[PDB]
């Protein structure tokens, strides 16, 4: 008997205000005290947003790493590992959000004469949280493209944080690829006209994406094709529309072309930015990752409408996540997913929501492509049932008594550290969870060592990536309940 291969690392996400909105590290004593509680619980490490708007706020290439170096030193001095998010997006900006950190002002200033740098909806509304993938390769920002800005930021991060990389503190780099750091469109704008569980909208009306669609349609001999018009609005349900209804126009030739185009452009966006990230971090002992949004609402209906508008072209007969996974394979990039704590019975009926099955699909797709897969909780939870759902997803086949299990999460990240987490019954429940994730072993500082990052393999075409879409395969079997519950 040797259960070591069952251990799943647990990280904790730091607060969104780990660094102040003025790019100063002002909460070191409070954080040190909280991290002592995480160390008492056996946590492997922490995760943090590295906000573009804080670091490159003054002007092009005027990177100010002062506060993040202080934070990282504190994490190192706590004995904790660190996962860093390259956060090329706005923090907050929704009603009730306490921490508000836009992308750099000098970047947004380009939008005064070129408002099409922002993802735009069908009524012209601009989303200011992130730069459209349409400007990835457009040299609009004082001579740089968006991808060049991302690459330059990551280069400066590597140079400045080299000591923490070499010391084995920084072990993962998650590359933000959209709003909320997620590789998606801003299809569900809470506070500007979406409420859960609306179907959302296609956010492809910026002039760069319209020109891209026109060129794509021209290349296949259909210059007359346009975006679908029969799509309703944010707060509709599928049957309110001709596009998303059962037996609707999403199934048509034109519908399929549009949906493939829309979802393919996110895949291409991820591929090109990951290639840059891989070149930056070549030879370092780190995991690169992306974050896939967890769009569980409408998963139970034929159109999977909310996945479609987010950019995930996922249907009963079409695996819209295994395509993404195949794109990641050459980079040896991982998937960081979400909804790990959710049961279907906890969701409202009208939302047609299937987080369990969505999690099983995404995990299975990553594993079939040979990827590491990690996960987060979607919503705040402190209770044993949530932790037991996470445990189930962490080891779908339970424990192997004498070797590695057939599948397991590479890690789990808990959202989010707060004073509430680390006191009272909440803390008691969290400690026991960490024990169970570790298969009742002590923390192992040497677990899951990473080889020096190799260069990405050969670029593959979108047609090659799309071979993974079909035939759609059933998920690997998941136990209904964990065999190592919190109790």
Describe it for me?
There is one protein chain. The protein is an alpha/beta fold and 487 residues long. It has one domain (1-487): Glycosidases (TIM Barrel, Alpha-Beta Barrel). Helix content is 32%, strand content 10%. It has helices at residues 28-40, 52-55, 66-77, 105-113, 146-160, 162-166, 207-219, 253-281, 305-310, 322-329, 355-368, 384-394, 424-437, 462-466; strands at 9-13, 45-51, 81-87, 118-120, 126-131, 170-175, 287-291, 334-337, 373-376, 411-414. An eight-stranded parallel β-barrel has the order 1-2-3-6-7-8-9-10, surrounded by five helices. Helix 11 (355-368) links the parallel strand 8 and strand 9 (373-376). The longest helix is centred in the middle third of the chain and has 29 residues, at 253-281. It is globular, with a radius of gyration of 22 Å.
CATH class type: Alpha Beta
Shape: globular
Task: Spell the H/E element sequence.
Answer: EHEHHEHEEHHEHHEHHEHEHEHH
Oligomer: monomer
> Total number of helical segments?
14
Main sheet: strand order: 1-2-3-6-7-8-9-10
Strand content: 5-15%
At the fold tier of CATH, the topology name is: TIM Barrel
Rg over CA atoms: 22 Å
Assign the CATH superfamily.
Glycosidases
Alpha-carbon distance between the termini? 23 Å
Q: What is the tally of beta strands?
A: 10
């Amino acid at each position: 008997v040797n259960v070591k291969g069952n251990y799943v690392q647990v990280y904790v996400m730091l607060p969104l205000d780990a660094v102040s909105v003025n790019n100063r590290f002002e909460k070191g004593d409070e954080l040190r005290a909280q991290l002592r509680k995480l160390v008492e619980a056996g946590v492997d490490g922490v995760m943090v947003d590295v906000w573009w708007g804080l670091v490159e706020g003054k002007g092009p290439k005027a990177y100010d790493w002062s506060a993040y170096k202080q934070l990282f030193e504190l994490v190192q001095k706590a004995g904790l590992k660190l996962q860093a998010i390259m956060s090329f997006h706005q923090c907050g900006g929704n009603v009730g959000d306490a921490v508000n950190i836009p992308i750099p002002q000098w970047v947004r200033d380009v939008g005064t004469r070129d408002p099409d740098i922002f993802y735009t909806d069908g009524h012209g509304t601009r989303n200011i949280e992130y730069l459209t993938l349409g400007v990835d390769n457009q040299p609009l920002f004082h001579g740089r493209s968006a991808v060049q800005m991302y690459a330059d930021y990551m280069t400066s991060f590597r140079e400045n944080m080299k000591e923490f990389l070499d010391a084995g503190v920084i072990v993962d780099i998650e590359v933000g690829l959209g709003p909320a750091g997620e590789m998606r469109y801003p299809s569900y704008p809470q506070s500007h006209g979406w409420s859960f569980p609306g179907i959302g909208e296609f956010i492809c009306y910026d002039k760069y994406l319209q020109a891209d669609f026109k060129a794509a349609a021209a290349a296949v001999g259909h210059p007359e094709w346009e975006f679908p018009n029969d799509v309703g609005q944010y707060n509709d349900t599928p049957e309110r529309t001709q596009f998303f209804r059962d037996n609707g126009t999403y199934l048509s030739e034109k519908g399929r072309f549009f949906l493939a185009w829309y979802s393919n452009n996110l895949i291409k966006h991820g591929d090109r930015i990951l290639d840059e990230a891989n070149k930056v971090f070549l030879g370092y002992k780190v995991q690169l990752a992306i974050k896939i949004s967890g769009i569980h609402w409408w998963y139970k209906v034929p159109s999977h409408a909310a996945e479609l508008t987010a950019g995930y072209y996922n249907l009963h007969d079409r695996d819209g996540y295994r395509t993404i996974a195949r794109m990641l394979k050459r980079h040896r990039a991982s998937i960081n997913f979400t909804c790990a704590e959710m049961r279907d019975s906890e969701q409202s009926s009208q939302a047609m929501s299937a987080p369990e099955e969505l999690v099983q699909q995404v995990l299975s797709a990553g594993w079939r492509e040979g990827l590491n897969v990690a996960c987060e909780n979607a919503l705040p939870r402190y209770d044993p049932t949530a932790y037991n759902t996470i445990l189930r997803n962490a080891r779908p086949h339970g424990i192997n008594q004498s070797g590695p299990p057939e599948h397991k999460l590479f890690g789990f990240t808990y959202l989010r550290l707060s004073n509430q987490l680390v006191e009272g019954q909440n803390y008691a429940n969290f400690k026991t969870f960490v024990d169970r994730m570790h298969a009742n072993l002590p923390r192992d500082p040497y677990v899951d060592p990473m080889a020096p990052l190799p260069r990405s393999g050969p670029e593959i075409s979108i047609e090659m990536i799309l071979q993974a879409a079909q035939p759609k395969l059933q998920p690997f079997p998941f136990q209904e309940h964990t065999d190592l519950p919190v109790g």
